[PDB]
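Hey all, sorry for the wall of text incoming. These are the eight entities for the joint prediction.
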Amino acid sequence: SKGTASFGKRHTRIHGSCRRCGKHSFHLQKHECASCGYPSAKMRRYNWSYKSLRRRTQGTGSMSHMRKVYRAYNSGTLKANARKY
Amino acid sequence: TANKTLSRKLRLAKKTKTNKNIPRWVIAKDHLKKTWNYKRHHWRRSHLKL
Amino acid sequence: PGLKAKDLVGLSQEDLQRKLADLKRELLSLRTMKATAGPVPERIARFRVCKKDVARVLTVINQKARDEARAAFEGAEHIPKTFRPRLTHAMRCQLTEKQKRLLPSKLMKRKLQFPKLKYAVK
Amino acid sequence: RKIRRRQTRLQKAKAIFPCPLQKLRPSVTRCSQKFNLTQRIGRGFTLRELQGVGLSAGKARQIGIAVDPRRKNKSEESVARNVARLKEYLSKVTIFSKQAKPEEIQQAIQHQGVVMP
Amino acid sequence: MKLNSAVTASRRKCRKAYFTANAETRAKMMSSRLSKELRAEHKIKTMPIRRGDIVEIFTGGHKGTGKVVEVRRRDYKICVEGINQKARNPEAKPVPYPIHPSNCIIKELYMNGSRYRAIKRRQERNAERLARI
RNA sequence: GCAGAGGCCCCGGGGGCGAAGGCGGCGCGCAGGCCCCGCCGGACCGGCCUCUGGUGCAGAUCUCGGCAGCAGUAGCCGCUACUCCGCGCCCCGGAGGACUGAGGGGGAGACGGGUUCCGCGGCGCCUGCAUCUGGCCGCGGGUGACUCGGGCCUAAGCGGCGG
RNA sequence: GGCGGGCCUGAGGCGGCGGGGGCGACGGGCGGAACUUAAGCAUAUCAGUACGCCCCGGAGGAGAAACCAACCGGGAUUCCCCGCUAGCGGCGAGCGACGCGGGAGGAGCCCGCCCCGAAGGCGCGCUGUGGGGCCGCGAGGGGGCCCGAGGGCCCCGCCCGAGAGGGUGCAAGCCCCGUACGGCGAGUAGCGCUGCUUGAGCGUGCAGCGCGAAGGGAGGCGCGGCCCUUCCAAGGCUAAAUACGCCCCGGGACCGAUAGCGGACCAAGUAGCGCGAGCGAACGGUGAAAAGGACGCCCUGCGGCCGCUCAAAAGACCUGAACCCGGCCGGCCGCCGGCCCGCCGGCCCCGUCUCGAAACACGGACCGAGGAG
RNA sequence: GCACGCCCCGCCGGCGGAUGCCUCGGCCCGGGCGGCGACGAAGAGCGCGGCGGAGCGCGAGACGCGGUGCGGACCCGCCCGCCCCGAGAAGCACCGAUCCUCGAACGCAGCGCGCCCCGGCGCCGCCGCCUCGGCGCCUGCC
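and here's what came out:
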């Protein structure tokens, strides 16, 4: 009754996929991502779990723009800066 | 489920497309030796989006 | 190999759009042939090449358009952001060296009054 | 750290080859009864000390002499000892003009360490 | 000793560099000593091995002279025509025995045109060194 | 005794003429232990002096990994049930006998699963017996809307609002 | 009264320009614990810490004295060395600076006021603008024996500005790559009361509210007086030395796959688990070379047997321990002692607290690895 | 009795993965760096390879495209594509573009709906500009 029979009544999705972080953590009733923090502008990052910070952080993904810019500064962005300055 | 959303239908679709074994030619090209996708899932045992 | 980019550069943009339409229709019929010939794969090394070819015509069509547009806004205040020096957000929001080294009139006079002098002590 | 600080000094010395790395600083009686007799380097020469050698605050800064206007002279003896230090330094220093003849600058010889320790 | 600190003596870094080297580095590492006559004609001790370069194997078993049919850059090995593993079946088509290029001396070089240009570049840099800088 | 460091090992320590490790047998030491021989093994390893320590296990309801005796033991006890013959499988077909018994072991939706759907082939896995079976495995397909539902309206509610 | 105009406040739209969000460090600003210690526990301690929030930058903050001192005086700031005690504290447990002195590093200035006014940064502004790294060559070794193969032996050589290192079929300065050598100043200060804070004690810094100056501040025991020494708050700027992750490079008396990161494995924050926040593995090694198994014999077939490749199956893989088990051969058996060896004699189950354990006290099936001054 | 169970005089076979040996990985310690974003970041989702699952890398120009300077034969299977004093494989360094959906995330939602000309359409500042409000301070006229 408390467990197996009541587990039989489990047929609804409390959470859904987040638009910002694509995890099954968007609460559908309250409309808040438990992990992403969406709909907030800022991301939900807490220093009590450093493991959570490590799972989604800068460098986990492609870093396509930052990698390009870093190499260019080590090549010909610094020169373009001095030309503008 | 019969009344699925489009967004949900497209995420589930990728799972069916990526539920494929390593191509035999790719094992020959990469000399993989280990021969199993592992990311493969079974509808009864898997709990996608859970 | 496929279409050489240098040969494409010599063509006008009307000539190049015609070539692009022919290459997209060719891609459509190669995709058709790959679907129709499902049991046996034929390698179809024209398919790969014409995909690249389409990209190499599109690269030449954009290069001519960007260069032409850049000269319409050359020497004009407020050019489009695509034609702006790349820099970075921090650099584009920073003081120029002249503005960093601007000195008040009384400080500037003092610097001129006392110039730096090379001196040696023994 | 020792290597990095040395490298910084060597690069600065190169940037102003004839100019010594350290500015001329005054002899100051160490503070307190415990260190009264002993003397040490201070921040800068007082304007009265630089009035005795006949200099001006700006002129002194160009010949590499540190100037402190906060420093009040206190005893007359302090003015005399520091004025003598300025006289010795002014004779020692050589000012190069004519923009920069390479030979005179090349033969200048950089001073190393506190000037007039 | 090595006076440049930037070069690494660490076995792990040096082993990794050999295993993961770029194809241009792999090709330079895959080089063989030129024969006395080739050394006199081209004025260079060794050349990177290519395909079509007759080589004499002078080291272990499978010692023979033949052209290089194939180069396995991934394995740092080359296949020499004539040098093959013993076949159980006479009918079976021969499988080549791979030979490291250090284990061979290049009797003849596929001249090409780029190879003339690359020998010339090395001969000119070698001569600046032989003039004692 | 262990693991590393600095030296030594008289022509520059011992090694594919066989290192470490493993196994059986000696010998030596009061003993920790050491040494040799044979066999397996297949590339490294020490004695001595000085130095350093994450340095020695039978226990901790010790951690982790293997695995024994129990033991071919306990069990495979719901929903009435199968039988004959035929390529003969619990497959399939025909024929008998049944059962779920229209708040069905019937035919459909909502949700939840997410390809389980269908055809062809297959049994390596799973189908707690078996399989020629299948929800399993491989391959190739499959969901068509002016009229149905979303969309749209508002409900409980929730978000928004100079502030 | 009614309309036009200026000024003053606002409203809509357009254009140019900026802002927002990210990063497990360092940095600034705030809000803020408790476990703990005090052998209890309230003050205290932890701790001006975790954590929450906000905000920059390559550093940041700080900073050119309303400073320190009491001298035969110094002289912005930051950082390092030393004093670790002056003090504070149920004066209990604890806590706690600084000035000297030695260093690294050095660098100074501006505005308001004030004078002139538009000379200006000119649609504004007289409610005051303006002036006072890449690139590149690169030395020198043969013979015999033997090995599956030398990088092994044994004779002889040679190159070292190179005997760092890596690779190559066994231990290579001379086989290869490299290495050494190159080139291109007012609602303020203060005070009264209150809260927080500090080592700061009749008050260290702060803040609320009430009240509020003029020559004012400080001098480490308050108050009133008189000196003296030293400075100028209530506005702003500033390099340097200092700190530090991601990442990149180098090194190590470091770890060696139950270790070292959770993660050495072509796909680790992966597979998997939890409604979710979050949790979170296991898994290295054939050989020199895939040469990954010739052929024949059989089998309904499955599969087996011969052998094949190889140095060797090393056959899905290096070595291959213990526990545990099957074949075959030998015995009938625990330990200690004696002897030809199955008889005689002796022998309770260890570890552990305990006065005392074989205990009907507790932990322990077994074995391997890990495991604690 | 035998078998069993023990022991082991040896000799093999199994099951396990210990022990050695290595090791493109960690872990400390120094340097260097300090380079993100409305010109759309970090992150996320779907795609993209002839044969293509994962990982990487790209983005409808997609397992890439161009330009320059290097390099000089390959391209992990099957292919086909090069091959040659240049004709140009792998590799390498910059630089120029492309860049779907979501995201600070920007017409509005989150996958459905507008308005509007043909440019598009978010918010908050700052500086100008244009339009106009007030029985704020007045003023002039008739």
